């Protein structure tokens, strides 16, 4: 019935139009009866009849006068629901203030008048006086005054003296003054001003008034003189025992204010003296303020035993406020909660339901069908018949169930799969039988978990359930990339049992026509489940366009593989099962099928795999016994040597040769080595236990030990668990985190010493406590993630944008962890794809890359292609489908309207359960050498030494693929060159970790001038160095007077002159920093590239504070300007540092601490956007200097590295999109729409500018700066005022929105929820689109 909402102040005539009468007396009920008075608070003439379709006197009885008024009682003959909404008004003798602007910290009246509220309150209660041009020459309109001053000015002027009091005076003053001259004078002042503290307030004032003038509201309306009154039902007064009432707080306040108004009216009825005029008006003021909001100013309860009364605000704010606890969090009927179990005989699209809850839930539907068949006559007859539960009820419920899906969820709805829908199938008992495979999706073990089942009502609900919430339609991971019907634990055991092969068993070596009779031999028990039988089988190939061509050939295989090929669908290659099928491989199987055959073949194939897995696993049978966990013999012997060597190490401490700490390191390392030895021994022992003869000679092969199958198959457990249970359990760490020196030499099969067990205890309690505490922080985290990305709704398909730069595979120092093809998988290109083959374009721009174009990249060795991205989308309050990428839940591209932001938030939040809260370089692969940022100088030896600390080295494969990446620490020598094809295992750089070198760039002598001996450089001839070394002490370290010239050693030629870098930059005199350890004595011939001095220098919280953008302990300062860097002056504390750009406004300095390391020198030709200091980097500068695209890469790389460290993968699109909402704000530099520096919505400013350039051709518009803001703060800065009012500071935000004439566009999600209107995101999106397209068109 609408699509947008605007909020503004009310108009008294409009208020009267809203009203339907005037209240005279507070008589809400009369004694000796129970019928309200006509002129009292409860008026039928104004609000309506309390008796349905009847006047009070009852003269017109609901048939002959329906809707018309009664001549006796002025009430229309209507129903009672109108009384729920019909409302009146109260006319005040004197206008009163709206105290919110009085009580708000940004006091709108005070801000508009630029005067605090202290005097305003005094004149409101008639303590101080308001002048209204009392004298044309002496004072102004906006001055305070006193009665004696009032008397003094009256005797002064009298004729022109005038000073009215109170709220009416305030209204007269504000009405008399305009806003235009105000806006011009304010804009003039802000244009030419220098003070900044008052500048912010002035900008707020001009913004408020310029919004006010556009809004069209009147400030005098702000001073209301008519107060609306709410309908009587909203103030409940139930008649209690003996003619009493609940005495709702609204009624008491209304009675108080009406009595005050009546007293004021009486006082003005006799021209009373001004002494009681002020008192009566003031008392009416406290009354009206208490009615509006009591306890804010005077706490005038006056109606209870020292307990507060809910005046008006209690029905708006507070948890008692119905908003976010009455439309967020609530009970519901038509549901059942119960314990669960496994019905391992059902389809994937089904779920069991026991009879009792089935009938109880569906009985309302039963009655509809019951009366439809007419077997029962009345509702009571049907109720009593179904009370006995005859034979008919079962068959009729079976009839109605078969098309009526139901919803199912678990209590911790972590992510999207927390809710599903199913086709019910009736079962006996009192337990919820569930399909096995989907059990993995819920992560719901059967340790006693409870799930709840809900039921839809309308046909729309059933249809959308069948469309979306069918688990058949939910197969892939919404999170990253994978089907969630990955086979479970027991099934993969049987499947692995299928694809084995012994060397000799019954029924082997013969040939079989096909899988049909192959099982016949096994069913007859005449052949092994696994052999080397040779079979000829027929397969199908999708090579033809839409046709599966058939071919066949004889192949050697195992018996079980034929059984699986019985059930495999048509178009699959045979080799996919010819290997040792594992847990990871079988999943990929489904994936491959999903990439070829579709959806129905995949689901039916998975169900059949589950059936066959259970059947054959049960048929095979494999327990685990004591004799299975065989102990390797040598293990004990091994620890003996370790023990011996440990004793030896103790002797080294006993003899005093070593200290405990290095002894500790020795013993822990040798214990770790022994653990590795015993682990490899036991895995070797278990790996090839089975040795079976075949035609005479014996021969080894892969073992059939039970634990070995649970290990290799990947069903459950890992090599760590097997090592623990079988071999050395290893030595763990003490609760402080330090590793105890005593290893626990035994395993679980053998007994443990009590001390060993006790040590092992607290290690497990650590993890248990971490898991127990984990359930709180993570979910709250998810909350902060959904609020920021609440709407993020795609609105149109393509905006035509072509922005974004160079999405490339990332190398993590060593080998690459993720390649290009999977990273770009599911993305849609923006720029055209150029193969590195001189204009041999592979993929056109603006095309979807699903697999085939990805398949076209590996052979072409393309290594850097950019695609579309949400950050590079220039829409308005929306995202383009062609700018987001392929949908994750479905193989096709994303459709229109879906809420990507919510999906991203839940996907990012779900893995929190898996995450805990708490000198040289060698090449490793064969490839070409590439150096980025080439800035190096050849040394005396002929090799290279780097002169730029930002230089980075990489290994590129000879085909152009990047394989390695390593940052080059400053002062690192080179042992190779660029482009040299070098195999792995070849060092190229050398340096010192704890000492950094500073190196000259030119050859020649070093005439040590421009330093002060003893003060700047000290001849600290230590015994170890044995030479007159040069140590440049710092200014604080050395004498203040001596260290006032920034000493610089003067490298000279044979002429002893200050040689320059030839003609280019600056002499060879390099300014020596503090603690410059120089061994040079005097006049030493030092060549170029020779060192001069040697300076002796929680994943979940990480995600949280990288999303909070919290400044780390070390904000690494960075050079935000170009030119040669310089050194600043010395100040009281942290020494200033100045920069010297080659042009522009070069004399720029900054405040720099000196205690922390400063890896900077005078001759560093820094550029626009390179680091000065080192350490952690705050997002603010990264955003503000090196663009949006750079900062996005850093944060996403950090978070994905954290998740990969946890071993959990999530696609970057979900983590990236919130980043775009991260940058939802921008500030202004060159104005023209805002004042000067309004930090506000970047999208709104951009859309205003884009039209403005085409409309107002010539105007500069606005030069902006897209700045960030904390996700919490960004949520506080939402443009949707209702969403802000949902959970914090309701009163303030509504007031500031109303004064600005805000018009909420209702484009969000929480706003649609709280009003209860249909969300225009899901199916409601089209419906709202259809409504606007058809209607209102």
């Amino acid at each position: 019935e609408f699509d947008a909402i605007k909020i503004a102040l009310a108009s008294p005539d409009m208020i009267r139009s809203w009203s339907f009468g005037e209240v005279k007396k507070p008589e809400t009920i009369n004694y000796r009866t129970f019928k309200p008075e006509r002129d009292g608070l409860f008026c039928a003439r104004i609000f309506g009849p309390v008796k349905d379709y009847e006047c009070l006197c009852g003269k017109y009885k609901r048939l002959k006068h329906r809707g018309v008024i009664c001549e006796k009682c002025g009430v229309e003959v209507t129903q009672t629901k109108v009384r729920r909404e019909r409302m009146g008004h109260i006319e005040l003798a004197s206008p009163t203030a709206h105290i919110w602007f009085l009580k708000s910290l940004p006091s709108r009246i005070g801000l508009l008048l630029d005067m605090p509220l202290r005097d305003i309150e005094r004149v409101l209660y008639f303590e101080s006086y308001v002048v209204i041009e009392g004298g044309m020459t002496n004072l102004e309109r906006q001055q305070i005054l006193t009665e004696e001053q009032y008397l003094d000015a009256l005797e002064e002027f009298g004729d022109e003296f005038d000073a009215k009091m109170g709220a009416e005076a305030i209204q007269a003053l504000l009405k008399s003054m305009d806003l235009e001259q105000e806006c011009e004078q304010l804009r003039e002042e802000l244009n030419e001003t220098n003070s900044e503290t008052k500048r912010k307030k002035l900008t707020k004032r001009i913004k408020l008034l310029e919004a006010f003038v556009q809004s069209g509201n009147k400030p005098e309306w702000m001073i209301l003189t008519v107060l609306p009154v709410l309908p009587p039902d909203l103030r409940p007064l139930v008649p209690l025992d003996g003619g009493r009432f609940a005495t709702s707080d609204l009624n008491d306040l209304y009675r108080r204010v009406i009595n005050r108004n009546n007293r004021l009216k009486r006082l003005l009825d006799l021209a009373a003296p001004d002494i009681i005029v002020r008192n009566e008006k003031r008392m009416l003021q406290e009354a009206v303020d208490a009615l509006l909001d009591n306890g804010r100013r005077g706490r005038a309860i006056t109606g209870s035993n020292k307990r507060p009364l809910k005046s008006l605000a209690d029905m708006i704010k507070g948890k008692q406020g119905r908003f976010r606890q009455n439309l967020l969090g609530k009970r519901v009927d038509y549901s059942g909660r119960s314990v669960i179990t496994v019905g391992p005989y059902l389809r994937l699209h089904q779920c069991g339901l026991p009879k009792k809850m089935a009938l109880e839930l569906f009985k309302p539907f039963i009655y509809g069908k019951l009366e439809l068949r007419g077997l029962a006559t009345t509702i009571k007859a049907a109720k009593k018949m179904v009370e006995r539960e005859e034979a008919v009820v079962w068959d009729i419920l079976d009839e109605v169930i078969r098309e009526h899906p139901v919803l199912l969820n678990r209590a911790p709805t972590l992510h999207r799969l927390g809710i599903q829908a199913f086709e019910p199938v009736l079962i006996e008992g009192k337990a919820i039988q569930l399909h096995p495979l989907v059990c993995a999706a819920y992560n719901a073990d059967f340790d006693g978990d409870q799930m709840a089942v809900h039921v839809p009502l309308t046909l729309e609900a059933q249809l959308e359930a069948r469309a979306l919430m069918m688990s058949t339609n939910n197969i892939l991971s919404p999170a990253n990339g994978e089907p969630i019907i990955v086979p479970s634990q027991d099934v993969v055991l049987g499947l692995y049992y299928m694809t084995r092969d012994c060397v000799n068993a019954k029924g082997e070596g013969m040939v079989l026509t096909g899988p049909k009779e192959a099982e016949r031999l096994y069913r007859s028990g005449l052949a092994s489940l696994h052999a080397r039988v040779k079979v000829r089988i027929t397969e199908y190939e999708k090579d033809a366009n839409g046709e599966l061509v058939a071919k066949t050939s004889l192949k050697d295989t195992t018996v079980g593989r034929a059984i699986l090929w019985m059930i495999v669908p048509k178009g699959l290659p045979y080799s996919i099962v010819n290997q040792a099928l594992g847990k990871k491989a079988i999943s990929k199987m489904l994936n491959t099928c999903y990439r070829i055959l579709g959806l129905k073949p995949t689901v039916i194939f998975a169900d059949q795999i589950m059936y066959t897995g259970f059947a054959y696993a049960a048929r095979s049978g494999a327990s685990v016994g004591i004799d299975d966990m065989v102990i390797p013999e040598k293990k004990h012997e091994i620890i003996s040597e370790a023990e011996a060597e440990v004793a030896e190490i103790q002797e080294q401490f006993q003899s005093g040769l070593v200290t405990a700490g290095e002894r500790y390191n020795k013993v822990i390392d040798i214990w770790a080595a022994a653990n590795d030895r015993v682990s490899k021994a036991m895995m070797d022992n278990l790996q090839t236990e089975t040795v079976i003869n075949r035609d005479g000679q014996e021969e080894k092969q892969v073992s059939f030990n039970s634990i070995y199958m649970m290990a290799d198959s990947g069903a459950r457990g890992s090599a760590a668990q097997i090592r623990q249970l079988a071999g050395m359990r290893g030595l763990m760490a003490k609760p402080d985190g330090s590793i105890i020196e005593t290893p626990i030499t035994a395993n679980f099969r053998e007994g443990l010493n009590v001390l060993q067990y006790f040590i092992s205890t607290h290690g497990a309690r650590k993890g248990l406590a971490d898991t127990a505490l984990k359930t709180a922080n993570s979910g709250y985290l998810t909350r902060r993630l959904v609020d920021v990305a609440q709407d993020l709704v795609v609105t149109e398909d393509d905006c035509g944008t072509h922005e974004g730069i160079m999405m490339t595979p990332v190398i993590e120092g060593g080998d690459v962890k993720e390649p290009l093809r999977d990273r770009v998988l599911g993305r849609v290109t923006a720029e055209d794809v150029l193969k590195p083959g001189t204009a041999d374009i592979l993929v056109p721009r603006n095309t979807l890359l699903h697999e085939q174009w990805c398949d076209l990249l590996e052979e072409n060795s393309v290594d850097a292609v950019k695609v579309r991205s949400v950050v590079s989308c220039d829409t308005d309050f929306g995202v383009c489908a062609h700018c987001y990428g392929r949908d994750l839940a479905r193989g096709h591209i994303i459709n229109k309207g879906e809420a990507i932001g919510v999906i991203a938030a839940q996907s990012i939040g779900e893995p929190g359960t898996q995450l805990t809260m708490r000198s040289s370089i060698q090449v490793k692969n064969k490839g070409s050498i590439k150096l980025s940022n080439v800035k190096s100088v050849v040394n005396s030896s002929g090799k290279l030494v780097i002169t730029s600390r930002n230089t980075e080295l990489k290994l590129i494969d000879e085909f152009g693929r990047t394989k390695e990446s390593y940052k080059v620490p400053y002062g690192a020598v080179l042992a190779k060159g660029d482009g040299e094809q070098v195999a792995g295992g070849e060092t190229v750089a050398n340096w010192d970790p704890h000492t950094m070198p500073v190196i000259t760039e030119v050859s020649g002598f070093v005439r040590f001038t421009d330093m002060i001996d003893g003060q700047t450089i000290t001849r600290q001839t230590d015994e170890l160095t044995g030479l007159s070394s040069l140590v440049v002490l710092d200014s604080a370290e050395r004498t203040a007077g001596g260290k006032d010239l920034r000493p610089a050693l003067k490298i000279v030629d044979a002429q002893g002159n200050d040689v320059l870098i030839p003609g280019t930059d600056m002499p060879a005199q390099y300014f020596l920093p503090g603690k410059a350890i120089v061994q040079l004595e005097d006049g030493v011939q030092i060549s170029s590239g020779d060192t001069l001095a040697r300076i002796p220098q929680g994943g979940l919280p990480r995600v949280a504070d990288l999303f909070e953008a919290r400044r780390p302990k070390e904000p690494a300062i960075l050079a935000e300007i170009s030119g040669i860097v310089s050194f600043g002056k010395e100040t009281k504390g942290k020494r200033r540092l100045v920069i010297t750009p080659v042009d522009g406004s070069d004399p720029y300095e900054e405040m720099i601490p000196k205690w922390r390391q400063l890896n900077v020198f005078e001759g560093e030709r820094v550029e626009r956007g390179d680091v000065i200091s080192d350490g952690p980097e705050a997002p603010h500068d990264i955003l503000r200097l090196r663009g949006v695209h750079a900062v996005t890469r850093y944060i996403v790389n950090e978070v994905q590295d954290v998740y990969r460290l946890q071993g959990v993968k999530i696609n970057d699109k979900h983590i990236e999109v919130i980043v775009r909402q991260m940058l939802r704000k921008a500030t202004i530099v060159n104005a023209g729409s805002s004042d000067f520096l309004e930090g506000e919505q970047v999208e709104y400013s951009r859309v205003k500018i884009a039209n403005r350039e085409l409309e107002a051709n010539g105007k500069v518009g606005a030069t902006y700066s897209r700045d960030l803001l904390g996700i919490t703060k960004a949520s506080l800065a939402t443009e949707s005022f209702i969403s802000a009012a949902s959970f914090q500071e309701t009163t303030r935000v509504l007031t500031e929105a109303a004064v600005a004439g805000k018009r909420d566009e209702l484009r969000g999600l929480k706003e649609n929820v709280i009003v209860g209107r249909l969300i225009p995101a899901g199916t409601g999106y089209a419906y709202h689109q259809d409504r606007m397209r058809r209607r209102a068109a």
Binding site: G598, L599, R890, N895, G1322, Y1325
Partner: peptide
């Protein structure tokens, strides 16, 4: 009855318009 809408997705694929038109057709 029918449990998979893969056919709906592959030819008239959209998860909102199909639902709304089916609802307003079966309303009768």
């Amino acid at each position: 009855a029918r449990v998979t809408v893969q056919d709906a997705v592959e030819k008239i694929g959209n998860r909102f318009d199909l639902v709304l038109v089916a609802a307003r057709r079966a309303r009768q």
